[PDB]
């Protein structure tokens, strides 16, 4: 025991030295100082490992003393979302059968998207190569591919673990999740299908920005126009006072509980899809020789994950606005 103690101490000292050094470096990098290319890569590595350690410690914490969400809160959320769809007459998205005229078309989109990664970079990794091969085969055997996908969705709730890395934007290093190609196709197709179905069924109300089919500057312009076109908005005569509130939903994806998320999805889509998606977020996150089961927290770097995030965003939006004001903003369900 004494030796174990001593070594624990000394690595804590060393660890302390490391972490602080890393922190110093990152501030240095932000400043834009003279720093070694090699040194910056080293710092990126250290900070990644540090991040992973932090993250999985948070997972442990979550496990060790229950979910952050109070069950009452969860219930309330459920009630809200239920109320919302009730008001909408929103028919849920089915599990996709062999019925579709669009099926092939949908598939073609996902493949195209995937191909977009590979058209530029001619020299490719092994994983990349595999993915490419899969894509090629899929083009060859569309119906068969579709069938395979369907089978996977029905069955597969344990996936290959997701490798990660950090792309180095020298302010803020960004995590890059790398799903194993076979599941990736599934993720793509599912995602595309979900978007087509969601937009077709009017899931996401107008007010959600990023997905609108309008350009971010265009979006901004539209917002400005809206602001102007409000009825007598600029008056300061009769004590009229406007306030604009920008804020960031901090860790909006990074603390989505799968249980709650699963149930939420089971509102909007066929439960099997929900089950799949929930099971996909629950992966083993390998990074550089350290792993952990991602027990609590959505992974942005799945293909469909965006949809999930958006759907979760809807919940938050509803909470903010309430049923009534949200209802107004959406308008009547029919028109």
């Amino acid at each position: 025991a004494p030796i174990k103690k001593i070594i624990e101490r000394y690595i804590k000292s060393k660890a302390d030295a490391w972490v602080s050094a890393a922190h110093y470096n990152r501030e240095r990098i932000k400043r834009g100082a003279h720093v070694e290319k090699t040194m910056v890569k080293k710092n990126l590595g250290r900070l990644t490992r540090l991040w992973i350690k932090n993250e999985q410690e948070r997972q442990r914490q979550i496990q060790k003393n229950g979910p952050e969400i109070t069950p009452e809160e969860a219930t309330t959320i459920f009630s809200v979302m239920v109320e919302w769809l009730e008001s909408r007459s929103f028919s849920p998205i089915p599990f996709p059968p062999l019925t579709y005229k669009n099926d092939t078309k949908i598939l073609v989109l996902a493949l195209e998207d995937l191909k977009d990664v590979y058209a530029s970079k001619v020299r490719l990794n092994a994983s990349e190569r595999e993915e490419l091969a899969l894509i090629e085969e899929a083009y060859d055997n569309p119906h068969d591919t579709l069938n395979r996908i369907k089978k996977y969705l029905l069955t597969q709730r344990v996936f290959k673990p997701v490798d990660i890395t950090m792309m180095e934007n020298y302010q803020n290093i960004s995590p890059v999740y790398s799903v194993d190609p076979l599941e990736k196709i599934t993720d793509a197709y599912l995602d595309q299908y979900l978007w087509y179905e969601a937009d077709q069924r009017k899931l996401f109300p107008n007010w959600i920005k990023p997905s609108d089919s309008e350009i971010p500057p265009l979006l901004v312009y539209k917002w400005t126009q809206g602001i102007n076109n409000l009825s007598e908005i600029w008056d300061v005569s009769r004590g009229q006072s406007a306030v604009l509130l920008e804020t960031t939903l901090g860790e909006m994806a990074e603390k989505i509980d799968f249980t709650l998320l699963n149930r939420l999805l089971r509102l909007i889509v066929d439960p099997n899809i929900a089950d799949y998606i929930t099971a996909k977020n629950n992966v083993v996150i390998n990074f550089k020789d350290m792993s952990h089961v991602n027990k609590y927290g959505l992974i942005r770097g799945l293909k469909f994950a965006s949809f999930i995030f958006q759907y979760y965003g809807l919940v938050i939006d509803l909470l903010l606005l309430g049923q009534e004001r949200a209802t107004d903003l959406a308008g009547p369900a029919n028109n």
Binding site: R129, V158, K160, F258, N262, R263, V293
Partner: protein
């Protein structure tokens, strides 16, 4: 032929992987992958994690354990990695159990031979090269001796050339004593002993000469 990796785990292959893992450990998955001509790094590591690692278990679940499982399913919906961890089992197996509850050789031999060859060859090129040079050096030495000896037999005495000294202060240890750190000065007298040992030495030299 070069190609994209995958396929199915043949038992021999599995065994090889296990051996590799014993050798290189659970975080050098590239090397282990390389050892297997068919299977990838990622594939390999996954396999080890999922099926092959002995600190997993595939024993059936007790009724209590079944209850724990299905209760977990009820409570954690299809987060099977988490569920697996809770169980203390690997996840695929758990899922399968849950589901149940609810209701050529030349090539192989090539890689084997190569494998065994590798595992029994555990030195960087520096080492191999060094031993090679050592044996070569030895050979050279004996050849030189054979010449020298031959000449002696022939009647021409040739002194063996020194090692071409690498630096100015390079030492030959037969010239004179290495760094004669003498014994501690004599309390008890040592004179006769000195004589006897000297005689023994000289006698030994004589013997060698005669030998």
């Amino acid at each position: 032929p070069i190609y994209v990796k995958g396929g199915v785990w043949t038992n021999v292959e599995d065994q090889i992987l296990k051996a590799a893992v014993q050798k290189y450990g659970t975080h050098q998955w590239s090397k282990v992958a390389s050892l297997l001509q068919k299977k990838t790094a990622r594939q390999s590591e996954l396999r080890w994690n999922e099926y092959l690692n002995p600190k997993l278990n595939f024993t059936e679940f007790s009724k209590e354990e079944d209850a724990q499982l299905l209760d977990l399913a009820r409570e954690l919906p299809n987060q099977w990695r988490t569920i697996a961890d809770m169980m203390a089992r690997p996840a695929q197996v758990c899922v399968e159990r849950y589901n149940r509850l609810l209701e050529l050789e030349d090539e192989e031999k090539e890689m084997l031979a190569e494998a065994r060859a590798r595992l029994l060859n555990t030195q960087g090129k520096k080492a191999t090269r060094k031993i090679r040079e050592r044996m070569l050096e030895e050979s050279k030495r004996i050849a030189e001796l054979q010449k020298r000896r031959e000449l002696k037999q022939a009647g021409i005495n040739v002194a063996i050339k020194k090692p071409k000294k690498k630096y100015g202060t390079d030492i030959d240890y037969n010239e004179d004593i290495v760094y004669e750190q003498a014994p501690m000065p004599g309390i008890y007298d040592t004179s006769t002993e000195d004589r006897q040992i000297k005689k023994k030495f000289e006698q030994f030299e004589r013997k060698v000469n005669r030998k």
